[PDB]
Amino acid sequence: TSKKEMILRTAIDYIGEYSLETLSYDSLAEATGLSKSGLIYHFPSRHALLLGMHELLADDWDKELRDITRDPEDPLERLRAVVVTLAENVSRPELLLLIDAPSHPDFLNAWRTVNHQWIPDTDDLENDAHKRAVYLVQLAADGLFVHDYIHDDVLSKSKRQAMLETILELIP
Template sequence: MRRSKRDLILDAAVALIAAEGLEHLSYETLADAAGLSKSGLIYHFPSRHDLLLGIHRHLADAWETELRTIAGAPAEECTDSQRLRAVVISMGRTADLAELIMILDARSDPEYKAVWADVDTRWMPAPDTSDAYLVQLTAYGLWAHDHVHHRPLSTDDRERLIAAALKQIPT
């Protein structure tokens, strides 16, 4: 199946953010990275806000697809435990730098934040003091760890921590 230009633009934007940071994302740098004209980008994304919203949706959709694949079903067809298991397995990997940057950027705009909140609401327990939420916080820590700590987790340590978190999921 041939990919759409919109998807090619969004993938190029994600790669550019990972390599150069969000502050270096412009129509000029993105046109060069995507191999398109600036007017071609503007056709799909008339404003920077539209482009950033598109990137947030693109990444959030990819994450939800991953969660569905891990769980074997959409969120609404899973139990709380099945959803949390998918979250732990997904977030047990190290965050892609572009994902982490965009998650942080989402705090700057209610529309961006809503994109991620939609996925969170379907898949994660609400913040509280429950054991399930503690497991979710562990998953967040695994996801961000290698970007905020001076010593990355080894593959073996990461796998052991994921297994330990999975054992803590309430049934």
């Protein structure tokens, strides 16, 4: 789409294949085919680029959730949408940015709104069994999301689906 979005998408793909560390105007220019002058025109600094990458992924998720949520006002339907979107294995770039987000308050802030609107709260969690039952679903969904990166082997398509349905049934 946008030349600007093209740059961001290319940078995201880049860190998954190489690393966040070597993402530079030199490597991004080679990857996009644009000159450094052309890159600066849209992203003044590496910080601006990284921030743009975080905001893009956060926006992607928000749009995905809004797109499949029955009633955005119903907590249980939002939870279902979260489970469904997290049921697909996370990509390397997104997992890397998620883990690196705390490197700067700006990156964390990029994910703040989507987190606040879709992730369940933990108010009085220690004394609310229903609160814990709901968060337990979030936890299992998170596990399915990263499963293939933290286990010595991946889930087959059928087994992943079987577990998705299992998590869905765990919803109160």
